[PDB]
Design a binder for this molecule. Structure first.
Ligand SMILES: Nc1ncnc2c1ncn2[C@@H]1O[C@H](COP(=O)(O)OP(=O)(O)NP(=O)(O)O)[C@@H](O)[C@H]1O
Ligand SMILES: [Mg+2]
Length: 330
């Protein structure tokens, strides 16, 4: 009912030793070589602390998972070990757990982050092209290794603006992509969910991450956080419909034999396509160019087979300032 455009082969061509995370045996580190300092974050199934690896006296992150669904835990570890050394992927330092409760933690590199609603308004046009390009690098890498993040959003993009470095964190929803598999649609955060998630289409792929990338980018360049502000998961589809249009939605559902749910009959009207240019303001004009709008317009498409691949998106003209800049550094 849908295969991915790119990289569909990958997990088949790497081994079952690459994707079969149920049978991974975890060689736990020593829980007591870490000391938790201060709370830096929270989560649905987690808590995150700044911490010290005692034997080296060094800063790191300790993220304490919820111990149940044991294989959901091995999934995140198998993905982190697989993506070892990948450009702009958060580095895995250790996996430890408590001797008595068997509650596990993942230990990752620390990144001196600025929270995005503070940091994003401080970006220049170049910053945006540059940090999106760096993030495209992580997305392309893990996609080319047969993995979907499925929770791309600002909150999982650590930026050390002083170091001009980027890390994609939180692979607790990352699943391996197997052609034709029916994945769970209850993934990603509301404001970054794809239309395929919102209409219960289960045979999605690496293109889901591109719709989310486009939701980030849209809010960066139009200065509208979040860009699609649905009150529930049904309102999410209507808020997207008010921009992309109800015509192109109906052609896409037909293209995929998706039958919309009956709740939508009363809430989903006929909406015309609002051009991207109506989101241009004076406060957000610094980020606007035709390169940018064109690029956003090829991320944010109902049909996931119409979205750019992360590889394709790096080729985009928008990023040419970044390409040539890094080349002249060379
Ligand atoms: N390497 C890191 N460096 C700095 N801060 C980090 C790092 N990893 C995580 N954090 C912080 O911890 C928060 C939560 O981390 P995360 O790994 O997304 O846990 P989570 O339980 O999966 N949260 P959620 O996004 O709701 O699923 C982030 O939003 C960051 O502020
Ligand atoms: Mg998570």
């Amino acid at each position: 009912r849908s295969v991915a455009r790119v990289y569909a082969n990958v997990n088949e061509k790497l081994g079952r030793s690459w994707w079969d995370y149920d049978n991974l045996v975890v060689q736990w580190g020593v829980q007591d070589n870490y000391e938790i300092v201060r709370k830096v974050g929270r989560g649905k199934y987690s808590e995150v602390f700044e911490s010290i690896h005692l034997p080296t006296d060094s800063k790191c992150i300790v993220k304490v998972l919820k111990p149940v669904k044991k294989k959901k835990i091995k999934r995140e570890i198998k993905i982190l070990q697989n993506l070892a050394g990948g450009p702009n992927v958060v580095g895995l330092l250790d996996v430890v757990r408590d001797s008595q409760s068997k509650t596990p933690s993942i230990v990752t590199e620390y990144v001196n982050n600025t929270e995005f609603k503070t940091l994003y308004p401080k970006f220049s046009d170049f910053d945006v092209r540059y940090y999106i390009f760096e993030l495209l690098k992580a997305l392309d890498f893990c996609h080319s290794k047969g993995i979907m993040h499925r929770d791309v959003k600002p909150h999982n993009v650590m930026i050390d603006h002083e170091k001009r470095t980027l890390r994609l964190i939180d692979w607790g929803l990352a699943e391996f992509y197997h052609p034709g598999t029916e994945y769970n649609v209850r993934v990603a955060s509301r404001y970054f969910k794809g239309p395929e998630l919102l209409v219960d289409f289960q045979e999605y792929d690496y293109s889901l991450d591109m719709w989310s990338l486009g939701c980030m980018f849209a809010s960066m360049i139009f200065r509208k956080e979040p860009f699609f502000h649905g009150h529930d998961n049904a309102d999410q589809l209507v808020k997207i419909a008010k921009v992309l249009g109800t015509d192109e939605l109906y052609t896409y559902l037909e293209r995929y034999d998706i039958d919309l749910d009956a709740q939508f009959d009363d809430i989903l009207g006929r909406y015309p396509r609002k051009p991207w240019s109506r989101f241009v303001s004076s406060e957000n004009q610094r980020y606007i160019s035709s390169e940018a709008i064109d690029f956003l317009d090829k991320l944010l498409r109902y049909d996931h087979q119409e979205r750019l691949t992360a590889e394709e998106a790096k080729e985009h003209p928008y990023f040419e300032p970044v390409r040539q800049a890094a080349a002249q550094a060379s």
